[PDB]
Design a protein around this ligand. Structure first.
Ligand code: 99J
Ligand code: CL
Length: 261
């Protein structure tokens, strides 16, 4: 197998119904990669779309400081494999779960940094006429040496002007997308990013439905247990505005005065 031949497994770092993700060292260069190994999806099925979106996303994207880098992908033995950059700090979900287990948080300075960096990743992706459509802390990865945030798990990436929408995590999903309005999808990434930062800031777990869910889509920010500048708060506020056209574009976001630096 090319997998065994080119790589040595070190550690299982992720798993799901699809299969697993392994931390591996490539024998030829001695570098660490995150390799996802999954059972070959049914040909034509939704999962085959997912797998295809991920590779054809790189076909357009390539390389960027705030997108998890792809190196290769292949299929063998009824499985598919994708070789990605290894981000040694895990996902923002791990970092948050580790903040809670151990009694920590993210300073306002750090929340802004998170917002700007993922913002730069979105700026790029949108500029390539694509949208990520599954922004959430578990799909934001962290490289340390001192931190770089990188957008990964491109399995939902689709076109701005010809969108095949498999709808993302309900907790981070904008209402217009649920309403089958796909005309401003870049602004759904912006909405999901806002709630991603809210999670990082220490908000209680986001609702999947119910009145709390609807109150958020009405433009009400989840409660943040720490004191943030009103300016920063308002930015997160407008980013989840019910009118997607009122939300800042990724460009406006990365150019925003409150995010200077
Ligand atoms: C290739 C697949 C997607 N992917 C990446 O491109 C990528 C890059 N860098 C890392 N770093 C990384 C993750 C986790 C950990 N852990 C977690 C905490 N644990 C106690 C042990 C250490 C350490 C370093 N990880 C990545 N990916 C990844 C790893 C696990 C799970 C999922 C996705 O949720 C899934 F859907 F693909 F499963 N993705
Ligand atoms: Cl939960």
């Amino acid at each position: 197998s090319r997998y065994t031949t080119e790589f040595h497994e070190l550690e299982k770092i992720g798993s799901g119904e699809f299969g697993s993700v392994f931390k591996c060292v490539k024998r030829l260069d001695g570098c660490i990669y995150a390799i996802k190994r999954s059972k070959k999806p049914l040909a034509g099925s939704v999962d085959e779309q997912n797998a295809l979106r991920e590779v054809y996303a790189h076909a357009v994207l390539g390389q960027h400081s705030h997108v998890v880098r792809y190196f290769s992908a292949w299929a063998e033995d009824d499985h598919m494999l994708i070789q990605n950059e290894y981000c040694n700090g895990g996902s923002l979900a791990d970092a948050i779960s580790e903040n809670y287990r151990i009694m920590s948080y993210f300073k306002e300075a750090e929340l802004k940094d998170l917002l700007l960096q993922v913002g730069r990743g979105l700026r790029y992706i949108h500029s390539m006429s694509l949208v990520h459509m599954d922004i959430k802390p578990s799909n934001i990865f962290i490289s340390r040496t001192k931190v770089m945030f990188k957008i990964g798990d491109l399995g939902h990436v689709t076109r701005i002007s010809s969108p095949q929408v498999e709808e993302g995590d309900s907790r981070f999903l904008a209402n217009e997308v649920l309403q089958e309005n796909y005309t401003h999808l870049p602004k759904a990434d912006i909405f999901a990013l806002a709630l991603t930062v809210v999670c990082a800031a220490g908000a209680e777990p986001l609702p999947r439905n119910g009145d709390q869910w609807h109150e958020i889509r009405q433009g009400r920010l989840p409660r943040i247990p720490q004191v943030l500048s009103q300016e920063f708060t308002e930015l997160l506020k407008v980013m989840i505005h019910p009118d997607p056209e009122r939300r800042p574009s990724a460009m406006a976001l990365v150019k925003h005065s409150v995010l200077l630096s």
